[PDB]
Each structure stands twice: as C-alpha cells, then as structure tokens.
C-alpha cells in the first residue's frame, strides 16, 4: 500500500469540499457511517491549516482505528502525521513504532519516523541546555 508523503499532510483542502465531506458522514449517519467516509472526512480534517480541525481530524480517527479491523495499518500512518501536525510528538512515537513493527522496510514509513525522531531529539536537547 502506498500512502501520502509528508508533504502531502500540509496540503488543505478547500473548505466546500472538506463540508461534502462531513455531510457525506453525516448522510451515512455518523458512528454508524462506513470507515471509508469517516477516514476521509478525518483526513481532510488532519490536512486543514485550522489547528482546531486538525485535533478533530485526528479525534475521529483514533475512534475508527479501533474500529478498522484490516485497515488498522495504514489508519496508524495517517494517525502518526496528525500527531506530528499537532506536535503531540510522544504520541506519534508511540504510533510509528508500532507501523514500524510491520514495515521495517518500508521507506514511507521510515521516512515518517525519522521525522518524528527530529522534533523528539529537538526537545531532548533542552533537558541538557
């Protein structure tokens, strides 16, 4: 499975097309709509500028990946960029870590942790200052 760069998480949708989105989850009937629709509509959330949006985007998100069953995998990817985004740092260790596990190869993935290692060691540095 190939899935969004880093680059690509900090690319907004425009906010017409991130409403057809809710109201498509919304028409589904919202907890019981498809993973499908929430996962998108969570993603345009982590993809929005709006700080707001983006913990609303990755709160939505964490509720469906318990829900996710086969797609547990690639929700831990997309989760781990919106705690990057967020800055929620520990958290997206946490997550990466454990994609990690499953993807020791995989250059996305690996891509995506180092990242997450920067801004760790960033603050590791000031326990020291």
Known sequence: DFWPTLKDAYEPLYPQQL??????????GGPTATIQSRFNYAWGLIKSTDVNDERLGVKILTDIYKEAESRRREC??????????????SMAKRYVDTLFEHERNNKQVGALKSMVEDKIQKEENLYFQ
Request: net charge negative; hydrophobic share 35%; with cysteine.
């Open 19 to 28: 409403e057809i989105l809710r109201q498509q989850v919304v028409s589904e």
């Open 76 to 89: 831990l990817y997309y989760l781990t960029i919106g705690c990057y985004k967020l800055g929620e740092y």
